Amino acid sequence: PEPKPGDLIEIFRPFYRHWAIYVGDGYVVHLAPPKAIVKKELLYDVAGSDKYQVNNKHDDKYSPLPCSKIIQRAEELVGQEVLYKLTSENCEHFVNELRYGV
């Protein structure tokens, strides 16, 4: 089933979860090493063969930003580097910041 634009994507990679944000038409916005940059890539490629799901876990208590703001922000961040560690705590924080705001 296809994710909605703005949906948080939890990719069950072996021994670690990788987070992304769906920005429509098959694409996700996520942090990746090409030292790590914000990339706009195909969900097909980012998920690979790994199991994944939509997980807007904080939607029950927190209110998501309008889907226009989620996409404008996520896409206007693409290209910008992050000099911090690619921890699942940080990958979750990065996407939660895009969906819910600061």
Swiss-Prot record:
Name this protein carries in UniProt: Phospholipase A and acyltransferase 3
Record note on quaternary structure: Interacts with PPP2R1A; this interaction might decrease PP2A activity.
Membrane topology (UniProt): Single-pass membrane protein
Sequence similarity: Belongs to the H-rev107 family.
pH profile of the protein: Optimum pH is 9.
Gene Ontology CC terms: cytoplasm; cytosol; endoplasmic reticulum; endoplasmic reticulum membrane; lysosomal membrane; lysosome; mitochondrial membrane; mitochondrion
Tissue-level expression: Widely expressed. Low expression, if any, in hematopoietic cells and thymus. In testis, confined to round spermatids. Expressed in normal ovarian epithelial cells. Down-regulated in some ovarian carcinomas and testicular germ cell tumors. Highly expressed in white adipose tissue.
